[PDB]
Amino acid sequence: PEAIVLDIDYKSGTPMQSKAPYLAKFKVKRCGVSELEKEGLRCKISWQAAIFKVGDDCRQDMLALQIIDLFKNIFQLVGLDLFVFPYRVVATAPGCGVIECIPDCTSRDQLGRQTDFGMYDYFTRQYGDESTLAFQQARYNFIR
Amino acid sequence: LVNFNHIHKRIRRVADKYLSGLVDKFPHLLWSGTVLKTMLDILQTLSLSLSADIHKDQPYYDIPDAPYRITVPDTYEARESIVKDFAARCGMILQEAMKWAPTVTKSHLQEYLNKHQNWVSGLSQHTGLAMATESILHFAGYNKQNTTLGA
């Protein structure tokens, strides 16, 4: 609710396996809340992906997301270094809701099907030997 | 000298062998007026880099008065080991230089300790000055009065 849509990409439609849930992409502008509220009665741009579902409940995910966000706030306040990504989700109809999509989606199952090997080989090929600088930062983020 | 602390394994060994050969065939480089300053500067740089928040990035450092760079390992143990290992060649070359021609190297050491930049930080560790003022002591000799006597 803190962004204003700009236009619709008329070629990003891609239904998924499943009940007829599809996928779409949007170009959005981020302004804020109060400015959005005051601008909604008179008339930094990136792209977003949305996933729609029909016939499924979207409340336990909402509660889990609230708990995760609270834990992230606690960790950020205390002064430690932990990373969690609280993707938003809103329910609007019985069995229907809107779920956000993380940027640059990369499922582990697809990578495993492509490679059929351990993740160590994948990240050795992707970044290089364990003695390089980038490998250390990747390992640190993985631990975090 | 700057390649004696390379991140690899055999590179520092071959560099040490080359340095030993070069100092063997040209003995007059020991009492030169530029090697000591550079080696003290790199020792001070390593000592400063000993505790620099390992998790913070950019392990590179710039040696003053000479265009070069030095990389350091990640764990504390490796850094401590490499600095301790390097802390011996300094004493070895200093005693070798002091053995033959004491006057020139003593004058150079006196001249080195008279720079304004290091005086401000002298209240801190500044390991180079401590190394110099420690190496001056236990390599001295007898003066004119007590140079020829029988115990």
UniProtKB/Swiss-Prot annotation, chain A:
Where is this gene product found? Cytoplasm; Cell membrane
Q: Which segments carry the region annotation G-loop?
A: 33-39
Q: Which domain of life is it from?
A: Eukaryota
Positions of transmembrane segments: none
Tissue expression per record: Expressed ubiquitously. Highest levels in placenta and brain. Little or no expression in lung, liver, pancreas, testis or leukocytes.
| Family according to the record | Belongs to the PI3/PI4-kinase family. Type III PI4K subfamily.
Q: What does this protein do?
A: Acts on phosphatidylinositol (PtdIns) in the first committed step in the production of the second messenger inositol-1,4,5,-trisphosphate.
Oligomeric state and partners? Answer: Component of a phosphatidylinositol 4-kinase (PI4K) complex, composed of PI4KA, EFR3 (EFR3A or EFR3B), TTC7 (TTC7A or TTC7B) and HYCC (HYCC1 or HYCC2). Interacts with TMEM150A; regulating recruitment to the plasma membrane. Interacts with TTC7A.
Q: From the record heading the sequence, give the disease linked to this protein.
A: Neurodevelopmental disorder with spasticity, hypomyelinating leukodystrophy, and brain abnormalities: A severe autosomal recessive disorder characterized by global developmental delay with impaired intellectual development and poor or absent speech, axial hypotonia, and peripheral spasticity and hyperreflexia. Brain imaging shows hypomyelination with decreased white matter volume, cerebral and cerebellar atrophy, and thin corpus callosum. Polymicrogyria may be observed in rare cases. Gastrointestinal defects and immunodeficiency syndrome 2: A severe autosomal recessive disorder characterized by multiple intestinal atresia apparent soon after birth. Affected infants have a distended abdomen, bowel obstruction and do not pass meconium. There is some evidence of inflammatory bowel disease. Death occurs in the first weeks of life. Some patients may also have immunodeficiency.
Q: What is the official name of this protein in its record? A: Phosphatidylinositol 4-kinase alpha
